[PDB]
Amino acid sequence: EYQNIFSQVQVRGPADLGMTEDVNLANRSGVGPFSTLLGWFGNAQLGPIYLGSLGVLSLFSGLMWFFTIGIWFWYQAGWNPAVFLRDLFFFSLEPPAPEYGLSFAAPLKEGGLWLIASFFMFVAVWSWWGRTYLRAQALGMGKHTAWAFLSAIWLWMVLGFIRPILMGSWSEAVPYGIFSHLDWTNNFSLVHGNLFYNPFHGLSIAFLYGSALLFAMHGATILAVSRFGGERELEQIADRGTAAERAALFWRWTMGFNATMEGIHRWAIWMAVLVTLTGGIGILLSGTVVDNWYVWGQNHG
Amino acid sequence: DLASLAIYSFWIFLAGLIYYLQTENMREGYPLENEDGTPAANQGPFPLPKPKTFILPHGRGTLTVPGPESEDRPIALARTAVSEGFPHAPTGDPMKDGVGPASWVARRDLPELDGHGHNKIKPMKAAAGFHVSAGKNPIGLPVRGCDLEIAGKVVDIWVDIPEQMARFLEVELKDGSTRLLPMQMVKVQSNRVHVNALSSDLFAGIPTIKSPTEVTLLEEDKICGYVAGGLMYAAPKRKS
Amino acid sequence: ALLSFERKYRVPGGTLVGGNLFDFWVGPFYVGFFGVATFFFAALGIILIAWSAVLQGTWNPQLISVYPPALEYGLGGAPLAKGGLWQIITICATGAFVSWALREVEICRKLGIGYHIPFAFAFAILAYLTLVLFRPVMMGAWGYAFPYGIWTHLDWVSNTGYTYGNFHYNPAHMIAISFFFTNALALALHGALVLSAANPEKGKEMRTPDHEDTFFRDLVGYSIGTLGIHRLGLLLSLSAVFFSALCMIITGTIWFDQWVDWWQWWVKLPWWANIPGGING
Numbered sequence A: 001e002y003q004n005i006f007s008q009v010q011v012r013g014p015a016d017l018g019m020t021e022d023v024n025l026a027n028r029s030g031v032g033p034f035s036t037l038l039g040w041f042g043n044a045q046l047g048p049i050y051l052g053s054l055g056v057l058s059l060f061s062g063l064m065w066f067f068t069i070g071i072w073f074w075y076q077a078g079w080n081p082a083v084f085l086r087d088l089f090f091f092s093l094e095p096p097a098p099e100y101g102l103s104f105a106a107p108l109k110e111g112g113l114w115l116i117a118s119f120f121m122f123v124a125v126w127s128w129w130g131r132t133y134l135r136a137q138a139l140g141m142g143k144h145t146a147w148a149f150l151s152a153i154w155l156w157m158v159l160g161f162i163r164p165i166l167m168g169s170w171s172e173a174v175p176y177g178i179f180s181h182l183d184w185t186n187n188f189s190l191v192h193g194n195l196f197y198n199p200f201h202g203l204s205i206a207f208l209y210g211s212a213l214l215f216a217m218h219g220a221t222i223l224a225v226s227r228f229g230g231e232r233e234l235e236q237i238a239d240r241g242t243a244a245e246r247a248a249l250f251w252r253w254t255m256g257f258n259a260t261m262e263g264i265h266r267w268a269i270w271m272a273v274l275v276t277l278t279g280g281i282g283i284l285l286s287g288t289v290v291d292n293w294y295v296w297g298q299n300h301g
Numbered sequence B: 001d002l003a004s005l006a007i008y009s010f011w012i013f014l015a016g017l018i019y020y021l022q023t024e025n026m027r028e029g030y031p032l033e034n035e036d037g038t039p040a041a042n043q044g045p046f047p048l049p050k051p052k053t054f055i056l057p058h059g060r061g062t063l064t065v066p067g068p069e070s071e072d073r074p075i076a077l078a079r080t081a082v083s084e085g086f087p088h089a090p091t092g093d094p095m096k097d098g099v100g101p102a103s104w105v106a107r108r109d110l111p112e113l114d115g116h117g118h119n120k121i122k123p124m125k126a127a128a129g130f131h132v133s134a135g136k137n138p139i140g141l142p143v144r145g146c147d148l149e150i151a152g153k154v155v156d157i158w159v160d161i162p163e164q165m166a167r168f169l170e171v172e173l174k175d176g177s178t179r180l181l182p183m184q185m186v187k188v189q190s191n192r193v194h195v196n197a198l199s200s201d202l203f204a205g206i207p208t209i210k211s212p213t214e215v216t217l218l219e220e221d222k223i224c225g226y227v228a229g230g231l232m233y234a235a236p237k238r239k240s
Numbered sequence C: 001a002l003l004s005f006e007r008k009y010r011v012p013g014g015t016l017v018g019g020n021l022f023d024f025w026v027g028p029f030y031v032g033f034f035g036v037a038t039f040f041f042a043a044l045g046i047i048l049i050a051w052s053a054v055l056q057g058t059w060n061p062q063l064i065s066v067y068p069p070a071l072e073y074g075l076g077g078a079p080l081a082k083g084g085l086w087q088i089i090t091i092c093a094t095g096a097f098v099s100w101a102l103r104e105v106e107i108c109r110k111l112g113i114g115y116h117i118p119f120a121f122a123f124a125i126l127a128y129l130t131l132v133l134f135r136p137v138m139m140g141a142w143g144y145a146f147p148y149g150i151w152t153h154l155d156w157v158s159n160t161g162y163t164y165g166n167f168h169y170n171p172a173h174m175i176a177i178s179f180f181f182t183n184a185l186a187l188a189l190h191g192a193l194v195l196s197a198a199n200p201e202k203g204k205e206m207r208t209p210d211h212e213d214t215f216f217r218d219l220v221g222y223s224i225g226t227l228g229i230h231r232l233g234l235l236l237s238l239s240a241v242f243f244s245a246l247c248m249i250i251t252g253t254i255w256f257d258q259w260v261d262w263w264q265w266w267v268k269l270p271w272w273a274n275i276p277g278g279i280n281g
């Protein structure tokens, strides 16, 4: 009983430049190497990547965010490489003090640098979002990947932009640091009367656990019926095989209801997006509408 | 207050979504039937969705689901009891008849095409220039059955071109003919390929393919069905 | 009632125990020996919970809570009303979970499919047994286990967590959260990519896996592929739950101090321990 977690044999052919459709091939790179290592688990082929204008705008924008934090971390380390490595987790680029409110007027050494790093990150993600849409259009595919990535952007937007604005200060935003953003998270909960009483936090968790449950179930199922070419999900949608039937009937006989080879992917995208969707609402209502979720919880309203 | 409105709103939305999702997952297998194949009276509280139509690429036309459902094959089973809910016993040889774990589906008797409308799955000898890049090369190894008898030798790998992975070994039998074995149902070892599902005497009865350089979705289902059926049905002849 | 394609699969055989005795369906549900075992342990378990609710003087789902024995009972039995119901209910629960896993094995055997689903489920069972059996037994009392109640179990997470300071600092807990977060990303992307191919721009033909592979190379320069993404999802989600159990097996046992303080192993390394400046010194 071989289990199909790793391949027993790799086969390689000429590198794959991919489908064309309306893609501008001027903007695609050359294929990178193959990877035997990767090739045991998935595809061996690195590349080619498509880098148009939006890619470079995003990538340049995104490195500027990373270096902007990194330069502050060096300053804090007093430019000592040993200290930098020692305290890497303890460094933190914090937002402007409540004093400066929603003003872009605070000095570099007191959150002005946080605003710069944030502006770069805002450009980075939004350009990258435009890129997920446009790369799909060019291949004539649905925009599921862009509408799903929006759900994640929603929580990130609420945490560092929308909610800070509605509270009326940049100090309400998340510091760029490893241990410091953990503290922010812990401290956020305490100040709001414990997020376990925030009913949106509770659903957020249900979905985050459902995402783990459902991909365990889905993954395991496809591997169980990969002996009838189950992984070939599009041709099983177009023309149902014993793979799709045995997959469905496993679940019908276990728990009394089942999915289709297409329908399971609707369960999937929704289970996952509902994490960051309920998440964002929970955070957005925290400090704006509800002071204390324990207290709110007592009235239910 | 704004938070209570938001959460009451959400639960209403979540209900409509669970309803939307359930009806979406009724586009195949429904409506439900009795064991005799007439439509069951109780269908559940969810209705059938309005049909949707996929346009299959490469001039293969359309699929519309939900649509009319028939097996388009005979089922060699008979009831073992006078009421619903009991097993149905194979009336013949379940491996030959293609029932239970040996079940296949009447899929299109065409091969899956890649994005460019070429065949997805070629023998590696007709795939320029696919080679084995890593792991043991199974080509030339003897194929042993669960009865620890040699049934044949591997003479090629059938490869997915666009996903670049091995999907079948082509096995030459005592008689000079070949068969395909799912890559997922064999253990490639240093010195042989081991097949747990089948004994040596059942390799002959693996369904054969009508063309030597392509395999159709129907043929795939028959081969894979037959091999998986072996786990239940060739159990008398399995050692350890 | 049966699915249109179901009858050809409802043949006899595949049972581990009982042979053909429990080898039947009730509506959609397969039964089998382990079907009966599940109903037994689950029925008895639900009686015991209602009994627990009677003693406690409440029929409110949001209030019913079955508590472990108090720490002074150690690893012995306790009176039904002061930890014994929890102990019996914990046996019943373990019985129903393991029964459910073995029932999935019999279904795997009938259908001639692999055993990946019950194997994956066994990781969830391990996590539960870490919390209610393995960790309490290493710490020397059933009292360290979580209570069976909707809000009281959340109360336990908060108290257990905050015992060790801010629990974020557990390094196994850090890895575990990473795998949960990543698995959600992976599920979002997998669901979206298949749907974007089957449901392309209005009036176009169904895309191929080639379009799927092409899309991901265009976006990030690598595609793991259609078999890879299914392997990856199984591994991300099973890993998340592995590191979850590991983060709690070590908490209370080999480490009982503040988790934040653990991280001094790195800061106090001798070759930068004394170097002035930075956050530490």
Ligand code: BCL
Pocket: A201, A202, A203, A205, A206, A207, A209, A210, A213, C046, C049, C128, C131, C146, C150, C151, C153, C154, C157
């Ligand atoms: C995992 C680490 C912690 C834990 C930390 C948290 C945190 C934090 C939260 C929860 C929340 C929940 N936890 Mg918990 N929880 C733990 C262990 C458990 C165990 C167990 C091991 O037996 C169970 C059954 C539950 C069940 C629950 C639900 C009541 C709720 C949402 C679960 C969910 O969506 O998952 C995904 C599964 C699905 C989507 C499938 C459906 C599962 C259904 C919903 C489970 C029904 C449980 C039912 C009430 C049990 C009694 C019925 C019996 C038959 C008698 N938790 C341990 C101790 N749990 C959330 C909540 O809202 O609490 C009030 C929440 O915020």
Ligand code: BCL
Pocket: A125, A152, A153, A155, A156, A159, A184, A185, A186, A187, A188, A189, A194, A195, A196, A200, A201, A204, A205, A208, A275, A276, A278, A279, A280, A282, A283, C157, C181, C184
């Ligand atoms: C002491 C801590 C508090 C607590 C305080 C908070 C706070 C505060 C928050 C949460 C949030 C969440 N909590 Mg909590 N939480 C607690 C205890 C728990 C417990 C538990 C007891 O076991 C669990 C399971 C959870 C679980 C969760 C999640 C469901 C939720 C985050 C969802 C998510 O996916 O974000 C991860 C996803 C994102 C952040 C989206 C990111 C998307 C962007 C666009 C990505 C950009 C990447 C960038 C470009 C970098 C690129 C780098 C490289 C290229 C890779 N909490 C306790 C009570 N929790 C969040 C929430 O939703 O609240 C309701 C949140 O804000």
Ligand code: BCL
Pocket: A185, A186, C097, C124, C125, C127, C128, C130, C131, C156, C157, C158, C160, C161, C162, C166, C167, C168, C173, C176, C177, C180, C241, C243, C244, C245, C246, C247, C248
């Ligand atoms: C204030 C609280 C502390 C904290 C204290 C703790 C404590 C204490 C624990 C965790 C644990 C976890 N924490 Mg923490 N944690 C905190 C903040 C977080 C944050 C965050 C964003 O802040 C996140 C994302 C997490 C995430 C996590 C996970 C890594 C982990 C829980 C998953 C798990 O074990 O599944 C495992 C899944 C199960 C146990 C479910 C098993 C289900 C069984 C098998 C079947 C049940 C069937 C059911 C009864 C049937 C119902 C009927 C049907 C519906 C018909 N924590 C804060 C800072 N955290 C837990 C852990 O690691 O557990 C091992 C843990 O004990």
Ligand SMILES: CC[C@H]1c2cc3[nH]c4c(c3C)C(=O)[C@H](C(=O)OC)c4c3nc(cc4[nH]c(cc(n2)[C@@H]1C)c(C(C)=O)c4C)[C@@H](C)[C@@H]3CCC(=O)OC/C=C(\C)CCC[C@H](C)CCC[C@H](C)CCCC(C)C
Pocket: A209, A210, A212, A213, A216, A217, A220, A254, A255, C038, C041, C042, C045, C046, C089, C092, C093, C096, C097, C100, C104, C117, C118, C120, C121, C122, C123, C124, C147, C148, C149, C150, C153, C237, C238, C241
């Ligand atoms: C390991 C990866 C993830 C995973 C995987 C996974 N779960 C699975 C499976 C798999 C592969 C199944 O095959 C199986 C299934 O059928 O899926 C629908 C299942 C399953 N996982 C489930 C739930 C579940 N999984 C969870 C977690 C996870 N499951 C992981 C994140 C959680 C979380 C996050 O908390 C829950 C709630 C069920 C829907 C199902 C198992 C059903 C089962 O065992 O049924 C038999 C028993 C009963 C019908 C109930 C018995 C009742 C008891 C005797 C009394 C109650 C005792 C209990 C301790 C009460 C405590 C409640 C309080 C905490 C509120």
Ligand SMILES: COC(C)(C)C/C=C/C(C)=C/C=C/C(C)=C/C=C/C(C)=C/C=C\C=C(C)\C=C\C=C(/C)CC/C=C(\C)CCC=C(C)C
Pocket: A066, A067, A069, A070, A071, A073, A115, A118, A119, A121, A122, A156, A157, A158, A159, A160, A161, A174, A175, A176, A177, A178, A181
């Ligand atoms: C070694 O040296 C090198 C060269 C490598 C440089 C070093 C790099 C290093 C060490 C990098 C380390 C980076 C780290 C640790 C970063 C951590 C980031 C984390 C954990 C982020 C967490 C959360 C972030 C959120 C929620 C941010 C939200 C941001 C927004 C929503 C954008 C908001 C935008 C604002 C405020 C600006 C608006 C302005 C205009 C004009 C629109």
Ligand SMILES: CCCCCCCCCCCC[N+](C)(C)[O-]
Pocket: A006, A007, A008, A037, A038, A040, A041, B135
């Ligand atoms: C998740 C991405 C990286 C995965 C790489 C793991 C490599 C595993 C190699 C397996 C060894 C080969 N073997 C013996 C299984 O055939």
Ligand SMILES: CCCCCCCCCCCC[N+](C)(C)[O-]
Pocket: A029, A030, A031, A032, A033, A046, A047, A048, A049, C220, C221, C222
């Ligand atoms: C998961 C991250 C993978 C990123 C891989 C990116 C591959 C890009 C290939 C660039 C080709 C350039 N060159 C000279 C090596 O051929």
Ligand SMILES: CCCCCCCCCCCC[N+](C)(C)[O-]
Pocket: A199, A200, A201, A202, A203, A206, A210, A267, A270, A271, B018
């Ligand atoms: C894709 C839909 C799946 C539905 C999952 C529903 C899980 C129920 C979670 C209950 C949590 C309720 N609470 C306490 C947060 O208000």
Ligand SMILES: CCCCCCCCCCCC[N+](C)(C)[O-]
Pocket: A255, A256, A257, B044, C027, C028
């Ligand atoms: C609160 C979450 C609990 C949800 C459990 C729902 C299980 C669905 C069972 C479906 C069986 C229906 N039936 C018998 C008509 O086939």
Ligand SMILES: CCCCCCCCCCCC[N+](C)(C)[O-]
Pocket: A256, A257, B018, B022, B043, B044, B045, B046
């Ligand atoms: C946690 C949410 C998941 C459970 C959703 C409930 C859906 C039950 C569907 C039963 C349909 C049964 N039937 C008759 C159509 O085969």
Ligand SMILES: [Cl-]
Pocket: C238, C239, C242
């Ligand atoms: Cl593991």
Ligand SMILES: [Fe+3]
Pocket: A218, A222, A233, C190, C194
């Ligand atoms: Fe899939």
